[PDB]
Amino acid sequence: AVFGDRVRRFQEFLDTFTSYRDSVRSIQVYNSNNAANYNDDQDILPHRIIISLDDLREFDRSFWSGILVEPAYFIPPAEKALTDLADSMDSPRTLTAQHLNKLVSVEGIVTKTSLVRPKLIRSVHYAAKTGRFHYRDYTDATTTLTTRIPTPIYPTEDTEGNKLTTEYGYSTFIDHQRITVQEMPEMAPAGQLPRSIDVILDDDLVDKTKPGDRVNVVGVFKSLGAGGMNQLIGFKTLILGNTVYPTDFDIRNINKLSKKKDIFDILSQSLAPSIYGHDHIKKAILLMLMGGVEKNLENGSHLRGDINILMVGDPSTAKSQLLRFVLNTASLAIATTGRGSSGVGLTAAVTTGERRLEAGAMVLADRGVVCIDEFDKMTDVDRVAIHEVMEQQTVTIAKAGIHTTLNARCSVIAAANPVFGQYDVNRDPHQNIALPDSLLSRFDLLFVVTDDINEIRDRSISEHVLRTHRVTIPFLRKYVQYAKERVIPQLTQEAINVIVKNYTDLRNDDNTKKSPITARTLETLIRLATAHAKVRLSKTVNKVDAKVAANLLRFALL
Amino acid sequence: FPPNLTRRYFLYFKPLSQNCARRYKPLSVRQIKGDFLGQLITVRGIITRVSDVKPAVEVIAYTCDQCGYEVFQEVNSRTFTPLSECTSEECSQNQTKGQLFMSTRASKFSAFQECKIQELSQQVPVGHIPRSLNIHVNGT
DNA sequence: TTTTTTT
Ligand SMILES: Nc1ncnc2c1ncn2[C@@H]1O[C@H](COP(=O)(O)OP(=O)(O)OP(O)(O)=S)[C@@H](O)[C@H]1O
């Protein structure tokens, strides 16, 4: 009697506010029109509703308190009232012991996604002689949210001797999945390994988190299992009842700001919030974040479009301090420092008896940024795999389990020291690094940074760092992903005449100073005008972008 | 004898083409929701790690050896259980029951083989790992 | 199927 009173009360409240009613109206009308277009020319949305915690507070604090205190009594009847209405219409650190048996909002990182298996709920069985169907359900502790008597064996020959032929199609199924979320590592105490728990999803939310993202989670803390009173520490935990959580004036501001001619320089100086000089270096980070164009050839292979730069310089020129700026400003990047053994270029498959995979560092940074620190200090083992990652954009893993082949087209930035000391221009331009020769042609830009001692520069470094101890960034990444979907460019005739003369300069006179001169350099000549056109959001390719690229080659090398 | 015990033939269904559906299906493994069981689907992919063909037992004959009848056990599951000494009509209501055993030439088999299908790697999302799936093959 | 050695 209690259940129907809670049902009718919440139904009255849901009937009290019609704001959600027109939402369900749009749900039903849209699914109707979607099935209407699918059944007229040729000859999706679920039923769960976001309920704000707005009106529940202005109606009954008793009922409010009941939801956030004992949710195992009010969410099922409220959904029951909703389904009736649908039919009438047609921190982990302080999480244990207390902050328990309630609805908990959890934040953290998506990691180690498990496997997808479906689960049966409603059985359909046909009897031969009676010529009738039947009905039988089964429940487990994930689905009921209430401690009910479990009813597990698949039925046959129930009452008279009629063959209970089971049927399908009409028999229902629901998928199932469990994932782990550890809290954010910067939030941790003085110095420790972060500790974690897990949350189980349901049917329409299977495979929404891949290992490696930033996710807010809202759900209910559910504890199952016989805690050692079965036959020594039990009562293992998990979380259920879940949701997934990762302007026109603003976009008009974007279109309005982009109507200028020197914002590349303005954004260039913008990306130096604490570093003096290195103007064209910031210009190159803008062009890397632009990402270039992708032109897959006719029945051939794709051509890589992003740009990768490794640095070398005197050990005091923000070599490592330029990296975290690129870390925070871009999107979906992972920083690798020092060693990278067993998991940068591979997945290793160490995981019922089966073989599973965990996406490695190079794979997880797909369509993103790879931050590599101390490239010469990397052991010689993975150096072979770096050529494959950087040139064919694929990773083939052939271990004893299953040989596979996949895609990762990541952007990579590295930072290395000279071989010994500061002799970066003293000995010879060649092999001040003692890197393999193919890696020279593999990387796009190679910066040589000196530590030239002067005085105007000395005073300017002084007041910059000194006032440091005593237009903006969020506008920029929005400007980036907006510039991604409609500013894709196309090459023009004017793009040819400059880079041809430029490649002639690369072979007739550039070889007299340094090396190498590859056709890949000419590909970068196309990519820079492309990225300049993406930053200016142009559609064509202009001669002026190539004029900029000539200075970019001179500043990067000569 | 049941008519299922004496068949010698098979029946194959037949899918509809998309041209007449246009006049009067491209699925992915990720698009294969685990809720379409019992339905009719159409997939595409790459055959990977094909196994070998081995015989599948269908029905079991049982020789009476005393009364001279033949007992039959039809199996459609993976496993089953042994039965009694005899299930003849004459061995029953008698002190000395028979003793049975199976037979090979009287049993019926069927072609059985399976393999794995890998994803197209063109329809794979940008940050996922491609899955695979098992498909059983029987008969012709 | 991966971590501390030494010729
Ligand atoms: N132009 C600059 N403006 C502001 N800070 C600067 C500048 N150049 C250097 N820094 C300083 O860069 C220091 C850190 O330098 P690092 O690059 O980490 O030294 P490092 O030894 O090269 O690092 P690694 O990773 O060991 S190579 C910080 O204290 C910054 O203040």
XYZ file of C-alpha atoms (C1' of nucleotides) and ligand atoms in Angstrom:
736
model
C 0.000 0.000 0.000
C 3.050 2.087 0.670
C 4.363 1.605 -2.885
C 1.226 2.916 -4.562
C 1.108 5.924 -2.298
C 4.647 6.871 -3.179
C 3.819 6.176 -6.832
C 0.723 8.357 -6.889
C 2.417 11.087 -4.891
C 5.369 11.339 -7.205
C 3.054 10.978 -10.182
C 1.046 13.885 -8.887
C 4.237 15.825 -8.519
C 5.349 14.848 -11.963
C 1.893 15.791 -13.086
C 2.329 18.982 -11.085
C 5.151 20.158 -13.299
C 4.521 19.753 -16.995
C 7.976 20.952 -17.924
C 9.218 17.357 -18.142
C 6.005 16.294 -19.793
C 6.680 18.273 -22.958
C 10.167 16.776 -22.934
C 8.702 13.263 -23.039
C 6.304 14.625 -25.653
C 9.265 15.603 -27.800
C 10.807 12.180 -27.110
C 7.756 10.339 -28.323
C 7.154 12.689 -31.257
C 10.773 12.446 -32.354
C 10.897 8.653 -32.129
C 7.593 8.554 -33.974
C 8.918 10.819 -36.711
C 12.157 8.881 -36.859
C 10.221 5.685 -37.416
C 8.051 7.631 -39.845
C 10.979 8.676 -42.031
C 12.449 5.174 -41.717
C 9.229 3.621 -43.065
C 8.312 5.946 -45.921
C 11.401 6.683 -48.017
C 13.026 3.265 -47.542
C 10.550 1.022 -49.337
C 16.971 5.238 -30.864
C 16.201 7.403 -27.881
C 15.677 5.542 -24.592
C 13.250 6.020 -21.702
C 15.110 7.518 -18.775
C 14.609 11.128 -17.813
C 17.009 13.673 -16.412
C 15.309 15.054 -13.344
C 16.777 18.162 -11.888
C 17.159 18.489 -8.163
C 15.361 21.786 -8.535
C 11.707 21.114 -7.992
C 12.176 18.191 -5.648
C 13.581 20.647 -3.158
C 10.637 23.033 -3.533
C 8.038 20.356 -3.064
C 8.841 18.014 -0.188
C 11.998 18.012 1.866
C 10.764 14.767 3.394
C 10.759 13.260 -0.080
C 14.003 15.114 -0.903
C 15.723 13.591 2.098
C 14.243 10.235 1.218
C 15.868 10.240 -2.213
C 19.339 11.174 -1.028
C 19.103 9.006 2.145
C 17.140 5.869 1.212
C 17.025 5.747 -2.622
C 16.045 2.091 -2.590
C 12.493 3.054 -1.816
C 11.825 6.018 -4.036
C 13.597 5.604 -7.379
C 11.700 2.404 -8.484
C 8.216 3.739 -7.598
C 9.044 7.057 -9.230
C 10.046 5.278 -12.382
C 6.897 3.194 -12.015
C 4.920 6.415 -11.920
C 6.808 7.561 -14.983
C 6.097 4.400 -16.933
C 2.485 4.682 -15.883
C 2.534 8.220 -17.214
C 4.101 6.964 -20.438
C 1.279 4.446 -20.811
C -1.353 6.979 -19.859
C 0.064 9.281 -22.517
C -0.246 6.551 -25.113
C 35.743 11.579 -3.371
C 36.802 7.983 -3.247
C 39.218 8.724 -0.392
C 36.472 9.487 2.132
C 33.887 7.275 0.554
C 33.689 4.328 2.882
C 31.369 3.605 5.834
C 29.624 6.972 5.807
C 28.826 8.722 2.486
C 27.541 5.070 2.154
C 24.155 3.572 0.977
C 23.309 6.876 -0.749
C 23.607 8.458 -4.140
C 27.177 9.573 -4.616
C 28.747 11.914 -7.178
C 32.175 10.670 -8.101
C 34.855 12.239 -10.212
C 37.914 10.701 -11.761
C 39.647 9.027 -14.706
C 38.303 6.376 -17.053
C 40.691 3.460 -17.057
C 40.852 -0.292 -17.946
C 37.467 -0.742 -19.655
C 36.162 -4.304 -19.324
C 34.472 -6.570 -21.887
C 30.891 -6.407 -23.225
C 28.593 -9.352 -22.412
C 24.789 -9.427 -22.806
C 22.374 -10.635 -20.121
C 18.922 -12.327 -20.312
C 15.919 -11.075 -18.323
C 12.563 -12.078 -19.821
C 12.044 -15.510 -21.300
C 9.427 -16.501 -23.833
C 8.435 -20.157 -24.065
C 5.961 -21.832 -26.450
C 4.033 -24.977 -25.607
C 3.248 -27.253 -28.542
C -0.082 -28.844 -27.592
C -1.659 -25.874 -25.841
C -0.414 -23.642 -28.639
C 0.271 -20.902 -26.113
C 3.232 -18.848 -25.050
C 4.551 -18.512 -21.517
C 6.467 -16.171 -19.265
C 9.422 -16.416 -16.873
C 11.891 -13.848 -15.553
C 15.133 -13.977 -13.612
C 16.889 -11.381 -11.467
C 20.361 -10.764 -10.058
C 21.803 -8.245 -7.652
C 22.784 -5.795 -10.374
C 19.265 -5.228 -11.702
C 16.835 -5.160 -8.741
C 18.349 -2.464 -6.434
C 16.280 -4.210 -3.685
C 17.158 -7.380 -1.779
C 14.731 -9.843 -3.433
C 14.740 -13.675 -3.556
C 16.897 -14.709 -6.546
C 15.196 -17.015 -9.061
C 17.948 -18.582 -11.247
C 17.309 -23.166 -14.194
C 16.064 -22.561 -17.736
C 12.541 -24.105 -17.709
C 11.080 -27.039 -19.657
C 8.090 -29.377 -18.917
C 6.405 -27.329 -16.216
C 2.827 -28.477 -15.567
C 1.279 -31.138 -17.789
C 3.961 -32.547 -19.976
C 3.669 -29.939 -22.649
C 6.963 -29.252 -24.340
C 8.126 -25.868 -23.243
C 9.762 -24.873 -26.477
C 11.533 -21.644 -25.798
C 11.273 -18.809 -28.274
C 13.547 -15.934 -29.138
C 13.405 -12.471 -30.603
C 10.605 -11.669 -28.157
C 12.753 -12.859 -25.249
C 14.511 -9.758 -23.903
C 18.160 -8.987 -23.255
C 20.226 -6.220 -21.681
C 24.008 -5.672 -21.988
C 26.296 -5.374 -18.965
C 29.651 -3.736 -18.086
C 31.955 -2.774 -15.149
C 34.760 -0.130 -15.138
C 37.214 1.339 -12.663
C 37.660 4.993 -11.853
C 40.517 6.185 -9.663
C 40.455 9.801 -8.506
C 42.442 12.545 -10.165
C 46.163 12.247 -9.222
C 46.859 15.956 -8.463
C 44.165 15.872 -5.753
C 46.049 13.208 -3.828
C 47.673 13.656 -0.365
C 51.385 14.461 0.287
C 52.863 11.580 -1.590
C 50.992 8.360 -2.396
C 49.743 5.938 -4.910
C 46.092 6.813 -5.614
C 43.492 4.211 -4.552
C 40.247 3.310 -6.371
C 36.785 1.714 -6.641
C 34.485 0.655 -9.500
C 31.044 1.533 -10.899
C 28.794 -0.744 -13.019
C 26.840 0.632 -15.972
C 23.655 -0.546 -17.690
C 22.072 -1.142 -21.065
C 22.064 2.144 -22.947
C 25.410 3.228 -21.451
C 27.641 0.313 -22.398
C 30.972 1.424 -23.981
C 30.908 5.125 -23.231
C 34.252 5.339 -21.413
C 37.470 4.227 -22.974
C 40.585 3.878 -20.769
C 42.077 7.318 -20.481
C 39.574 10.166 -20.219
C 38.169 12.680 -17.709
C 34.705 11.733 -16.454
C 32.289 12.971 -13.759
C 30.096 10.116 -12.443
C 26.736 10.234 -10.657
C 25.353 7.043 -9.267
C 24.387 4.927 -6.297
C 26.844 3.080 -4.037
C 25.784 -0.564 -4.084
C 27.377 -3.288 -1.946
C 26.687 -6.921 -2.856
C 27.758 -10.402 -1.829
C 27.731 -12.507 1.305
C 30.483 -10.952 3.376
C 32.300 -13.977 4.624
C 29.260 -15.466 6.272
C 29.069 -17.863 3.334
C 31.270 -20.666 4.559
C 38.418 -13.552 5.335
C 37.362 -9.963 4.604
C 34.237 -9.511 2.483
C 31.519 -7.068 1.452
C 33.077 -6.024 -1.805
C 31.705 -2.826 -3.431
C 30.497 -1.191 -6.674
C 28.214 1.634 -7.929
C 24.842 1.520 -9.873
C 22.054 3.854 -11.206
C 24.372 5.758 -13.396
C 24.761 8.776 -15.661
C 27.683 9.878 -17.860
C 29.379 13.267 -17.559
C 32.596 14.134 -19.457
C 27.180 30.116 -27.624
C 25.698 32.061 -30.480
C 27.096 35.275 -29.022
C 30.358 33.442 -28.418
C 30.517 31.915 -31.880
C 29.626 35.336 -33.282
C 32.582 36.712 -31.338
C 34.661 33.986 -32.917
C 33.523 34.912 -36.408
C 34.007 38.570 -35.574
C 37.492 38.221 -34.092
C 38.618 36.091 -37.035
C 37.953 38.993 -39.388
C 41.386 40.403 -38.590
C 44.831 40.052 -40.134
C 47.328 39.724 -37.303
C 45.645 37.457 -34.760
C 48.226 34.826 -35.548
C 50.776 37.104 -33.974
C 48.385 38.024 -31.159
C 47.724 34.402 -30.401
C 51.434 33.820 -30.796
C 52.218 36.210 -28.007
C 49.238 34.893 -26.048
C 50.697 31.470 -25.706
C 53.741 32.857 -23.853
C 52.166 33.604 -20.494
C 55.550 33.270 -18.731
C 58.331 32.857 -21.345
C 60.308 35.639 -22.946
C 61.084 35.516 -26.624
C 60.721 32.470 -28.858
C 58.105 34.077 -31.049
C 58.252 31.759 -33.986
C 58.374 28.806 -31.641
C 54.920 29.754 -30.428
C 53.939 30.121 -34.065
C 55.000 26.560 -34.656
C 52.953 25.332 -31.680
C 49.938 27.100 -33.226
C 50.567 25.302 -36.460
C 50.850 21.983 -34.669
C 47.571 22.555 -32.924
C 46.054 23.391 -36.322
C 46.904 19.834 -37.397
C 46.993 20.303 -41.182
C 44.953 18.580 -43.885
C 44.620 14.857 -44.533
C 44.602 13.792 -48.179
C 44.271 10.070 -48.717
C 45.426 9.265 -52.230
C 43.367 7.495 -54.840
C 43.711 3.725 -54.145
C 46.965 4.226 -52.316
C 47.648 5.165 -48.717
C 46.900 8.069 -46.461
C 49.418 10.865 -46.028
C 50.157 12.064 -42.505
C 49.092 15.634 -41.869
C 50.134 16.592 -38.395
C 53.572 17.959 -37.576
C 56.134 16.736 -35.028
C 58.952 18.773 -33.476
C 61.739 17.630 -31.124
C 63.949 20.087 -29.359
C 67.620 20.559 -28.596
C 69.163 23.559 -26.913
C 71.154 24.912 -24.034
C 69.738 23.496 -20.818
C 67.916 26.620 -19.643
C 65.507 27.692 -22.321
C 62.225 26.304 -21.081
C 62.892 23.041 -22.990
C 60.842 21.304 -20.325
C 58.783 24.417 -19.451
C 57.254 24.696 -22.898
C 55.869 21.232 -22.583
C 53.319 21.666 -19.892
C 51.873 24.676 -21.705
C 51.162 22.413 -24.645
C 49.888 19.797 -22.156
C 47.190 21.977 -20.665
C 46.236 23.937 -23.793
C 45.626 21.040 -26.169
C 43.129 18.214 -25.752
C 43.651 14.506 -24.988
C 47.420 14.396 -24.467
C 49.698 12.146 -22.350
C 53.181 13.222 -21.197
C 55.994 10.621 -21.293
C 59.216 11.349 -19.392
C 62.359 9.258 -19.338
C 61.679 5.614 -20.003
C 58.744 4.157 -21.938
C 59.370 0.398 -21.868
C 56.671 -2.194 -22.577
C 53.630 -0.126 -23.418
C 54.453 2.965 -25.457
C 54.284 1.391 -28.919
C 52.493 -1.824 -27.871
C 49.602 -3.065 -25.764
C 51.217 -6.325 -24.451
C 47.883 -8.177 -23.896
C 48.596 -9.293 -20.302
C 45.087 -9.817 -18.927
C 38.030 -16.229 -17.803
C 40.874 -17.572 -19.953
C 41.279 -15.034 -22.746
C 43.505 -12.419 -24.329
C 42.507 -8.771 -23.990
C 44.286 -5.540 -24.851
C 45.182 -2.276 -23.048
C 45.821 0.663 -25.385
C 49.369 1.898 -25.047
C 50.743 5.406 -24.927
C 51.109 5.926 -28.671
C 47.672 4.448 -29.411
C 45.752 6.325 -26.711
C 46.966 9.672 -27.913
C 45.151 9.271 -31.251
C 44.144 12.619 -32.795
C 46.081 14.194 -29.948
C 49.419 15.245 -28.523
C 52.310 13.110 -27.323
C 54.676 14.787 -24.899
C 58.066 13.033 -24.889
C 60.705 14.071 -22.397
C 64.416 13.156 -22.545
C 64.514 11.432 -25.917
C 68.215 10.508 -25.810
C 67.770 9.113 -22.281
C 65.178 6.721 -23.673
C 66.632 3.209 -23.819
C 67.636 1.809 -27.178
C 64.885 -0.843 -27.172
C 61.850 1.236 -28.162
C 63.846 3.387 -30.646
C 63.110 0.877 -33.387
C 59.316 1.138 -32.890
C 59.350 4.897 -32.968
C 60.143 4.901 -36.717
C 57.060 2.765 -37.429
C 54.770 4.867 -35.266
C 55.989 8.108 -36.760
C 55.904 7.034 -40.383
C 53.173 4.514 -41.177
C 50.680 5.795 -38.531
C 49.941 2.190 -37.555
C 50.878 -0.252 -34.847
C 51.090 -3.980 -35.558
C 51.268 -6.113 -32.453
C 52.237 -9.713 -33.084
C 52.586 -11.585 -29.850
C 51.744 -15.242 -29.349
C 48.100 -14.472 -28.799
C 46.820 -12.698 -31.927
C 48.658 -10.606 -34.492
C 46.627 -7.416 -35.143
C 46.894 -4.049 -36.958
C 45.340 -0.705 -35.862
C 45.503 3.114 -36.291
C 47.023 6.003 -34.296
C 47.846 9.320 -36.058
C 49.190 11.230 -33.052
C 51.209 14.454 -32.856
C 54.546 14.090 -31.037
C 56.831 16.579 -29.279
C 60.195 15.574 -27.833
C 62.933 17.426 -25.936
C 66.566 16.354 -25.804
C 69.938 17.688 -24.635
C 73.159 17.865 -26.659
C 75.602 14.946 -26.216
C 77.965 16.635 -23.779
C 77.862 20.096 -22.361
C 76.779 23.179 -24.234
C 78.781 22.501 -27.431
C 75.852 22.875 -29.742
C 77.476 24.960 -32.514
C 81.112 24.513 -31.596
C 81.970 21.030 -32.918
C 79.905 20.374 -36.088
C 76.204 20.825 -36.956
C 75.962 17.121 -37.486
C 75.552 14.625 -34.639
C 75.506 16.963 -31.666
C 72.762 14.597 -30.491
C 73.964 11.134 -31.624
C 70.563 10.010 -32.863
C 69.873 7.618 -35.765
C 70.032 9.186 -39.211
C 66.479 8.297 -40.226
C 65.089 10.157 -37.235
C 66.453 13.382 -38.769
C 64.212 12.987 -41.763
C 61.380 11.640 -39.571
C 61.053 14.823 -37.488
C 59.735 18.015 -39.025
C 61.400 20.828 -37.088
C 64.698 20.775 -35.228
C 65.329 23.727 -33.000
C 68.810 24.631 -31.878
C 68.646 26.909 -28.868
C 71.637 28.864 -27.678
C 72.238 30.677 -24.369
C 73.617 33.836 -25.898
C 74.751 36.257 -23.157
C 73.994 39.967 -23.692
C 72.608 42.766 -21.619
C 69.340 44.072 -23.082
C 68.265 40.472 -23.054
C 69.677 40.043 -19.562
C 67.691 42.897 -18.157
C 64.527 41.808 -19.948
C 64.894 38.290 -18.546
C 65.385 39.808 -15.159
C 62.230 41.928 -15.125
C 60.184 39.167 -16.713
C 61.029 36.523 -14.138
C 61.091 39.035 -11.325
C 57.687 40.525 -11.933
C 56.618 36.951 -12.619
C 57.062 36.214 -8.986
C 54.659 38.979 -8.129
C 42.938 36.968 -25.522
C 42.897 34.277 -22.865
C 43.415 30.547 -22.850
C 39.768 29.311 -22.637
C 38.900 31.391 -25.655
C 41.602 29.603 -27.605
C 40.641 25.895 -27.403
C 37.101 26.819 -28.344
C 38.620 28.732 -31.251
C 40.497 25.545 -32.093
C 37.714 22.996 -32.170
C 35.504 25.494 -33.941
C 38.240 26.061 -36.486
C 38.376 22.278 -36.983
C 35.003 21.636 -38.602
C 34.581 24.332 -41.274
C 37.987 25.815 -41.965
C 39.412 22.755 -43.745
C 41.355 24.093 -46.716
C 42.228 23.354 -50.311
C 45.442 24.058 -52.179
C 45.586 26.698 -54.912
C 47.945 27.481 -57.805
C 49.655 30.205 -55.776
C 50.846 27.544 -53.332
C 52.974 25.866 -56.012
C 55.174 28.686 -57.350
C 56.691 29.601 -53.993
C 57.440 26.156 -52.603
C 58.950 25.038 -55.915
C 61.492 27.844 -55.800
C 61.868 27.056 -52.116
C 62.695 23.407 -52.717
C 65.221 24.534 -55.331
C 66.756 26.657 -52.589
C 66.748 23.592 -50.349
C 68.812 21.622 -52.799
C 71.083 24.266 -54.302
C 72.141 26.155 -51.166
C 70.708 24.601 -47.964
C 72.977 21.577 -48.393
C 75.958 23.949 -48.241
C 75.178 24.670 -44.574
C 73.250 21.749 -43.007
C 71.222 18.659 -43.959
C 68.794 16.813 -44.822
C 66.608 17.800 -47.688
C 63.779 15.333 -48.191
C 60.530 15.376 -50.073
C 58.930 15.215 -46.617
C 60.197 18.777 -46.211
C 58.177 19.725 -49.259
C 55.208 17.988 -47.653
C 55.731 20.202 -44.643
C 55.817 23.139 -47.092
C 52.305 22.192 -48.017
C 51.287 21.490 -44.402
C 52.424 24.863 -43.073
C 50.368 26.819 -45.596
C 47.537 24.486 -44.687
C 47.843 25.124 -40.959
C 48.204 28.855 -41.585
C 44.990 28.710 -43.540
C 43.294 26.880 -40.657
C 44.407 29.480 -38.172
C 43.146 32.285 -40.380
C 40.138 29.998 -41.146
C 40.610 30.524 -44.871
C 39.328 28.047 -47.385
C 41.903 28.547 -50.137
C 45.701 28.468 -49.769
C 47.472 31.833 -50.110
C 50.956 32.830 -51.202
C 51.389 34.735 -47.954
C 51.189 31.551 -45.869
C 54.113 30.217 -47.892
C 55.959 33.496 -47.339
C 55.513 32.816 -43.619
C 56.750 29.245 -44.030
C 59.990 30.461 -45.638
C 60.770 32.316 -42.435
C 59.698 29.269 -40.481
C 62.299 27.189 -42.234
C 64.962 29.831 -41.766
C 64.195 30.260 -38.073
C 63.985 26.534 -37.471
C 67.307 25.754 -39.092
C 69.337 28.740 -40.378
C 11.206 -44.203 -35.474
C 10.936 -40.430 -35.285
C 11.136 -38.588 -38.617
C 13.907 -36.445 -37.199
C 15.964 -39.604 -36.971
C 15.619 -40.212 -40.694
C 16.280 -37.009 -42.561
C 19.272 -37.185 -45.016
C 18.523 -33.575 -46.063
C 18.887 -29.958 -44.923
C 17.054 -26.651 -45.420
C 18.583 -23.249 -46.026
C 16.850 -19.928 -45.627
C 17.303 -17.173 -48.075
C 17.958 -13.465 -47.504
C 16.290 -10.613 -49.353
C 18.284 -8.304 -51.600
C 18.416 -4.560 -50.971
C 17.217 -3.717 -54.508
C 13.685 -4.985 -53.965
C 13.763 -3.454 -50.478
C 14.597 -0.210 -52.270
C 11.730 -0.856 -54.658
C 9.204 -2.305 -52.209
C 22.420 -4.854 -44.131
C 25.697 -2.943 -43.458
C 26.272 -3.645 -39.757
C 29.386 -3.280 -37.606
C 30.412 -5.470 -34.663
C 29.934 -2.471 -32.370
C 26.514 -2.105 -33.948
C 25.779 -5.678 -32.955
C 23.956 -4.926 -29.776
C 23.579 -7.870 -27.446
C 19.806 -7.418 -27.556
C 19.096 -8.621 -31.115
C 19.143 -12.315 -30.206
C 16.757 -14.375 -32.302
C 16.593 -11.719 -34.986
C 17.927 -11.867 -38.536
C 21.159 -10.028 -39.220
C 23.770 -9.508 -41.932
C 27.408 -8.745 -41.073
C 30.699 -8.211 -42.868
C 34.307 -8.476 -41.805
C 37.519 -10.495 -41.985
C 37.822 -14.236 -41.465
C 40.502 -14.753 -38.851
C 41.846 -17.972 -37.283
C 39.644 -20.410 -39.098
C 39.375 -23.654 -37.204
C 39.061 -27.102 -38.741
C 35.934 -29.115 -39.544
C 35.190 -31.967 -37.124
C 32.097 -34.189 -36.877
C 29.138 -33.224 -34.722
C 27.107 -35.979 -33.050
C 23.333 -35.588 -33.469
C 21.421 -38.717 -32.406
C 22.565 -41.749 -30.474
C 21.493 -45.263 -31.297
C 21.381 -47.886 -28.593
C 21.396 -51.573 -29.407
C 19.301 -53.725 -27.110
C 21.383 -56.907 -27.709
C 18.846 -59.017 -25.775
C 15.366 -58.234 -27.059
C 16.749 -56.911 -30.354
C 15.215 -53.450 -30.277
C 16.922 -50.126 -30.887
C 16.784 -47.282 -28.372
C 17.461 -43.774 -29.644
C 18.835 -40.742 -27.865
C 18.666 -37.424 -29.662
C 21.132 -34.816 -28.418
C 20.886 -31.132 -29.341
C 22.971 -29.808 -26.431
C 26.710 -29.814 -26.045
C 26.750 -32.559 -23.412
C 24.300 -35.188 -22.214
C 24.277 -38.092 -19.779
C 24.495 -41.883 -20.103
C 21.300 -43.853 -19.889
C 20.383 -47.223 -18.387
C 21.230 -50.762 -19.440
C 18.321 -51.052 -21.899
C 15.086 -49.325 -22.784
C 13.494 -52.039 -24.806
C 9.822 -52.785 -24.660
C 10.573 -56.446 -23.960
C 13.588 -56.046 -21.601
C 11.195 -54.257 -19.254
C 8.789 -56.229 -16.968
C 11.446 -58.958 -16.893
C 14.099 -60.048 -14.441
C 16.982 -60.017 -16.915
C 17.223 -56.617 -18.554
C 19.449 -56.117 -21.555
C 22.709 -54.269 -21.808
C 23.132 -51.556 -24.346
C 25.929 -49.676 -26.039
C 26.015 -47.046 -28.706
C 26.702 -47.573 -32.375
C 28.485 -45.496 -34.961
C 26.873 -46.497 -38.230
C 23.375 -45.999 -36.894
C 24.048 -42.557 -35.437
C 23.643 -39.402 -37.543
C 26.280 -36.673 -37.841
C 26.538 -33.157 -39.224
C 29.306 -30.872 -40.453
C 30.541 -28.475 -37.740
C 33.222 -25.738 -37.799
C 33.685 -22.213 -36.417
C 36.075 -19.243 -36.816
C 36.522 -15.587 -35.781
C 35.631 -12.335 -37.555
C 37.717 -9.221 -37.017
C 36.441 -5.656 -37.496
C 36.979 -3.737 -40.755
C 39.392 -1.270 -39.049
C 37.882 1.555 -41.047
C 34.683 1.741 -38.994
C 36.607 1.577 -35.697
C 36.330 4.695 -33.473
C 39.340 6.915 -32.929
C 40.073 5.697 -29.424
C 38.880 2.131 -29.242
C 40.347 -1.302 -29.730
C 38.661 -3.500 -32.347
C 36.770 -6.511 -31.125
C 36.099 -9.843 -32.799
C 33.252 -12.379 -32.826
C 32.644 -16.137 -33.214
C 30.518 -17.501 -36.077
C 29.470 -21.163 -36.359
C 29.405 -22.885 -39.775
C 27.424 -26.054 -40.461
C 26.646 -28.365 -43.359
C 27.322 -27.567 -47.014
C 54.226 -13.820 -20.485
C 56.999 -9.870 -17.679
C 61.647 -7.827 -13.697
C 67.252 -8.027 -11.634
C 71.516 -9.424 -13.774
C 77.080 -9.977 -16.556
C 79.742 -11.636 -19.575
N 62.622 32.480 -20.610
C 62.172 31.953 -19.471
N 61.108 32.519 -18.884
C 60.661 32.005 -17.737
N 61.124 30.970 -17.047
C 62.170 30.419 -17.656
C 62.748 30.840 -18.845
N 63.816 30.039 -19.182
C 63.877 29.173 -18.201
N 62.871 29.296 -17.291
C 62.843 28.457 -16.100
O 62.784 27.141 -16.548
C 63.000 26.488 -15.294
C 62.859 25.011 -15.513
O 63.793 24.714 -16.565
P 63.962 23.284 -17.106
O 63.801 23.361 -18.550
O 63.046 22.280 -16.390
O 65.437 22.919 -16.735
P 65.989 21.589 -17.347
O 67.115 21.036 -16.578
O 66.301 21.804 -18.824
O 64.797 20.609 -17.323
P 65.080 19.156 -17.737
O 63.702 18.495 -17.976
O 65.792 18.420 -16.570
S 66.083 19.177 -19.398
C 61.993 27.212 -14.377
O 62.509 27.616 -13.118
C 61.622 28.449 -15.216
O 61.616 29.613 -14.416
